Amino acid sequence: PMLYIYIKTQNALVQRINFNLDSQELPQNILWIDLLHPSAAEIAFISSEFNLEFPTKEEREEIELSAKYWEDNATITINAHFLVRDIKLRTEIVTFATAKNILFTIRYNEFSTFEEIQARILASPKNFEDGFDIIDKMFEVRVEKDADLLEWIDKEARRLRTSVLEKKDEYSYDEMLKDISSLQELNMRVRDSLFDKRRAMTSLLKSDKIDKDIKQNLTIVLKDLNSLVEFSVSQLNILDNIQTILASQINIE
């Protein structure tokens, strides 16, 4: 049950404070508040200090569980999509929220993609003026990590493509089918993860809480995201065709 507060320092750098809710005093110049394994104390803390609640039924608005983006006059909420090990992956969701120009992330597990997000924010030369600048950089880091995963699948697909097409350096036909099937699932999960981030960034673009600097950056990430979706689709066709060729060999032989 941990609470990390990221502040903009006097020297215009970011510093991470391991914050103790029950005793310590709140810092100045907060950029981003990270809640890991929150208990009712941490949930009570952000509500009492930043007016941040998450009921699924309220009087003022119809809350739709069939969306992953919600915005009222003061806050934006995003249930953001991540992939974590279950190689077999599974969906992990992190709640993002904005209040008083501060980014909030609420997470229930620690996973490697979020550690990479932490390291990049702490080491970026970018000057973050508020929490909206943070989420801007996070979307960029998240699309890169999805790209690295498509690249890894690409390496594995080329090895399989060579092995099956030229019938050279093959192993167990069943084992090759297991791998192809595993890569197909990874490809499908990353593409869907990329679709989720497209919908969120596009909804952020419409907010008037987001200044022109962030909208320009989200647009650049969106173009690259689209490139990765194209790459993922070409890649899945290759995997499906390797599976078809491999099944053809089993049956013919």
Closer Cβ to Ni ion, 210 or 238, answer by number: 210
Q: In angstroms, give the least distance from the CB of 134 to Ni ion.
A: 11
Question: What are the CB-based long-range contacts (under 8 Å, 24+) for 161-164?
Answer: 161/238, 161/242, 164/242, 164/245, 164/246, 164/249
Strands 102-107 and 30-36: parallel
Q: In angstroms, give the least distance from the CB of 138 to Ni ion.
A: 15
- Other beta carbons within 10 angstroms of residue 28's beta carbon come to 6
Closer Cβ to Ni ion, 136 or 179, answer by number: 136
User: Could you tell me how far CA 115 lies from the centroid of its own chain?
Assistant: 11
Amino acid at 55: P
- Other beta carbons within 10 angstroms of residue 250's beta carbon come to 11
User: Could you tell me how far CA 36 lies from the centroid of its own chain?
Assistant: 16
Touching Ni ion, residues 67-96 (CB under 5 A):
none
Touching Ni ion, residues 36-55 (CB under 5 A):
none
Q: In angstroms, give the least distance from the CB of 133 to Ni ion.
A: 6
Q: How many residues bind Ni ion (CB under 5 A)?
A: 3
Q: In angstroms, give the least distance from the CB of 8 to Ni ion.
A: 13
Q: In angstroms, give the least distance from the CB of 197 to Ni ion.
A: 21
Touching Ni ion, residues 110-149 (CB under 5 A):
129
Closer Cβ to Ni ion, 174 or 211, answer by number: 211
Per-residue tokens: 30: 């907060």
Where helices occur in the chain by DSSP H, the ranges are 40-50, 112-123, 131-165, 173-205, 212-252
Touching Ni ion, residues 188-227 (CB under 5 A):
211, 213
Closer Cβ to Ni ion, 115 or 213, answer by number: 213
Q: In angstroms, give the least distance from the CB of 135 to Ni ion.
A: 12
Q: Does 101 engage in binding with Ni ion (CB under 5 A)? A: no
Closer Cβ to Ni ion, 129 or 154, answer by number: 129
Which letter, b or e, does each residue of 123-139 get, where b requires 16 or more Cβ atoms within 10 Å of its Cβ?
eeeeebebbbbbbbbbb
Per-residue tokens: 65: 């569980």
Closer Cβ to Ni ion, 80 or 210, answer by number: 210
Closer Cβ to Ni ion, 103 or 176, answer by number: 103
Q: Which residues make Cβ contacts (< 8 Å) with residue 198, sequence separation at least 6?
A: 222, 225, 226
Q: In angstroms, give the least distance from the CB of 213 to Ni ion.
A: 4
Q: By CB under 5 A, name the binding residues for Ni ion.
A: 129, 211, 213
